[PDB]
Every structure is written in C-alpha cells, then in structure tokens.
C-alpha cells in the first residue's frame, strides 16, 4: 500500500501568559513518531514510537538542532505577521505548518506537500508542481514575493524528492510490523429503544489500524447515508482507532438493516446485522 | 527527518 | 504552582518611562505579591497585594530590580503560590552613553557573524546589548579594561532576520547593576541575502561633470518593494520604492542631485514590512565627476 | 479571527468490564485556537495524573488532543470529561456511557 510522512508545526504567541511556544510533531501515516516542545526544560526532538528509538545520537542531535532553529524562525515569523496584518502586540496568534511526502508501494514519490496557516486560515501553499506558490491574501503575497526571490521552492522540492522519501522508506522498514500490517476492526451491533415504536441500531468498529475505514448502514440494500449518524474516528490510545455509525429504525424492522464495514485489514468486507 | 530551511523567513 | 511574570512593553525601560508587571497565575491576572531578589521572602511595599497588573509610571531608579511574584492560592500551607520566573527591570538614563560599533560593519551576510563592540571612557563594570523591540532580553558581558577604556565584544550570529534590527548598548557601574547608562547611539544591523542581487546602472552613464544629471537605476526581475542605494563612505543610505515596468522588471531611479561628488555605488532590494532584510548586493558601480 | 468550539468524546480504550483495568479517554477535536482545559472527572472529582497526547491538527487546521488515564470501572462510579475553551461561555461536561 501507499504511505505518507508529515511534520506539523504549531507556533503560538501568548503575551502575558508565557513565552512564545513552538510545537512540532512527526507522523508516518497515522502513527506519531517524534515530538519537539520548546516549553520543555531542555527542548529536544524526542521519540514517540518505539521503532525510532534505536536511531543513533547523530540523528537526535541533528533533529534537535533543526527544531531549535525552526522555533527561533517561527517566533520571528509571528512578529512579521503582526506587521503584515497591523495587529496589536497584545493579542495571541498561531502559525501552523505542514509538509511531507506520499509514496507508492514501490517506495517512489507520488506527491509532496507544504502548507501554511495563520490564525486557523490558509496563508500560503506550495503547489503540486513543487515549484510555485499560491497565496491566500495580500499579506501572504509578501511572503510569496520573498520566497520567489530566495528560490525557497527549489529547497522544498529538493527535500520532498530526496530526504523526505528516503527517510519515509527507512521509517517504514524500521516499524514494518506495526506500520505495514493493517489491524482489522472488531465489530458488533447494539440496540437501544428510544420509544415504544423506534430504536437505535449502532454499528461498532474497534481496535483497527490504520484509521481509514468505511461504516455504512443499508436497509434492504439501499444506502442510508442521509439518515445515518456517523461519529468522528477517534484514537484508542494504543495506536488503534474506533468508530461507530447509528441509524434509527422502526421497531420490528431491525432485520431489514445491515451494517457494512470496509477496512484494509479485512480480506473481504463484512455485513453485520443485529441479533437479539 | 525534518526539513532544514536555514535563514528562510515569512 | 508557578506563575508567569512579565514586563510590558519592555523590561529595559528609560527613567521617566513606564513598565507594567503582570503576574499570570491560575488563568487570572490579579491578587499577587512581589519580591525583590535580595529579600527573598520580604514582600515589597509592606506586603501589598496587587489587585491587578502593577504599573510603574513614571519609572524611577527605585523601580530597578530583580523581581518574582506569588499568586494567591487560598488552600495551601502559605496561602500563596511558589515563586514565578524572575524578571529584571533595568532602568536606563543614569550615566553618560557608551559607544557601539560593528566589526567589520553593519551589513552582515546571512549565515555569517558580526561583532558588536561597546566601549566607553567611563569604567563600566558590565555592558548590555539590547535589540530594539517588544519583549527583547538583553545580553550581558563584563567590561574588560585596557588603554583607559572599558569595552565588550558581543558576537552575533549565525545571521538571520531574527538577529537583524536596531541595536543599542549600555553600561552599568559596580554597585547599581540594574541601573543602566543612557543608550549608545543606535546601530542598524542589516542581514543581506539570499534574495537575488539586483542590477545597478547609470543614466546616461557613470561619467559626468558640471551641473549635468546623473541617475542610478536599481533593477531586478524579483518583486522588491524598495531599493537602497549605497555609496562607499556611509554618507548615503538612500531608499526609494520600486516601480514595475512593461518588461516585468522592478526598478527605482535615483537622481543623484546638483552637487553629486561620486564614488562607488551598490544597491539592495528589500520587501514591505522588513526594513532590516536586504537582498545580496548588486555588482559595484563607480561614478566619476 | 474566526474561532472553532471543540467536539468531545468520552470512552474507554477497551470494552469496559467492572473490576478490570482499562483506560478512560477524552478526545477533543475540531477546536481553534489551541488553548484548552480538559479534565477527567470521577464522581465529579478531578482525576489526578491524566496524560495527553502532543498537540496536532487536522487538514482544516483545527487541533485535536487525547487525554487519558488508567482506571478500573465499577458500577457505582460515574466518569465524565470537563472541557473549557475561549469559545465556551461555561465548561462542558460529557458523561461516559457504558451502554452506548
Ligand atoms: C535574579 O534573581 C533570580 C533569583 O530570584 C536569579 O536566578 C537571577 O540570576 C537574578 N538575575 C540577575 C540578573 O541578577
Ligand atoms: C573585539 O573586537 C575588536 C575588533 O574586531 C578586536 O580588535 C578586539 O581584539 C576584540 N576584543 C576586545 C577585548 O576588544
Ligand atoms: C525594462 O524597461 C525599463 C524602462 O525603460 C528599462 O529602464 C529597463 O532597462 C528594462 N529592462 C530590461 C531587462 O529590459
């Protein structure tokens, strides 16, 4: 299957409540594997999945050094943003960054990504060609001018085509038995009355990896995507995920309803029904 | 491994 | 536990100015006491409980000092929190100003290093280097003494936009270490690169005399918002906004003036809202009168 | 700036059995800005030693956090998660439901 690596930065100013803080996390697919927090006593890039812990000290020192520099850069970017938007030094603001690469089953690059946000809204983004930018507003157009004159896209592109893919392939091999082994969901259907004439059927999926999954209710084979209540997929805490889907049914019509489940860890899709 | 962008500002 | 103490808008503050100390604790800004460093549990102003941020205004030399706060914790052994981080209020304007110079000079290529030298004929025990701005912390160094002056070398680098801006230095004397001199004259430290260098050219050209006209054009395909014309000697830091031309270049024509004396010129592009970040320098150009 | 209120979910890591060790999760997602207060409550009392995941965010830039603690459920004990956020005028209490 295909895979992805992502880094997310959050830089936040909080005047009067703390010093500006920089949070970075790294993901392979749905599995977090590194973190950096500038609010720690001695900030360091630190392992968050067991399969990265046996990387040598040269790796940790390089990552930490880079994270300290990025924390310094983004603290200054918060100040620059204040001037571009003419905002007070009193308010609290947030810069968010994402970048990373998607690879195919052969391990070769399918696409690269790099996007920036300010105060929760799109700021500037690297286009799919990895050589041009899309700016969300006139402030971001300033940054685009600068990044064109400094040829910043060539630097993103060189990382996305090279180190990003080579490291993702290295990580996937390091964690092969948990990163490349889909865990299928455990499923069941529960039933609760809401009146003397209607009842909830809830279809459950637990313990699955990765997070992508489809839960669907059918009634006589027709999709109920309009009358289906779906809950956001949620983490179990142990690197598996959970989800449910619910539909309201007339009492005595439960047997007309089937829950269908699709997941990579399932050899074929499951059809479930509620059994008294 | 993380992206290293020395000297790049907004 | 531990409050977050902060000074606003700056902990380095001129006498006659103003600074406020805030004590943020349990999602609130009120009910706290203050403590100076030497008297570690003698709360100041006879144990005054500040019911809001403490505005020192106008600042006097008596405001200078090394502070911690404690927030009201009404269910605990002492009834107050642990001590905060320490904030040092430095009050300036109490001695003659020292001097600040950059070696080799104030234009620093990105990634490189520069030395800011503070020096004085007054024997200052320490020197402080402070970048102008909001919530900027000073750097301290003891003053070496030699040739009848005291001096300190502050090394700045690797140069990035964070390290660029307007700098001042200050001296302090032995027995009033939170009392600072008046500020040195300011020094703008500009980072250059890696934005691509523009092109320099003269109209009609680099040779002229009399009351004839001599205009220098700085030009680039990159979208600089401003240009800076710089002749060797430091007597022209002239800046003009850029205009986009039909061929898509960005340009600014600098008319020298009726008494142009000439010398070697370079120009730099820079962008809106970032006056201390310049492009690489153009190739040099010499004008002759 | 436009702000976004948190979605909340309270649930155990495994199917809960009375008298068996487990983990009690409060998942907060879809919120912005990032500052948020999240408490796990036992019989209305704040549980000490709750952990949380490192701050991250979704494609639409909204943040998500998982808070979690080890807990042994009993019939008598009632758990909930309390969440407060700038967008929330008052804290929000979401009760854990073993029957769901
Ligand atoms: C200020 O006092 C604190 C102790 O409260 C100490 O850690 C710090 O070194 C002092 N700072 C200066 C500049 O004297
Ligand atoms: C400081 O820098 C200057 C100029 O670069 C140099 O001459 C001097 O030796 C350095 N050290 C002191 C103590 O002045
Ligand atoms: C673009 O046009 C302007 C307007 O005359 C001229 O000054 C400049 O030299 C031209 N540049 C190029 C590269 O053609």
UniProtKB/TrEMBL annotation, chain A:
It is found in: Cell membrane. Disulfide bonds join 101-164, 203-259. One of its GO terms (cellular component) is lumenal side of endoplasmic reticulum membrane. Keywords: Disulfide bond, Glycoprotein, Immunity, Membrane, MHC I, Signal, Transmembrane, Transmembrane helix. The keyword Hydrolase does not apply. It is a single-pass membrane protein. The keyword Transcription does not apply. It comes from the Eukaryota. Residues 185-271 form the Ig-like domain. One of its GO terms (biological process) is antigen processing and presentation of peptide antigen via MHC class I. Belongs to the MHC class I family. This is HLA-B alpha chain (B*5703GB). It comes from Homo sapiens. The gene is HLA-B.
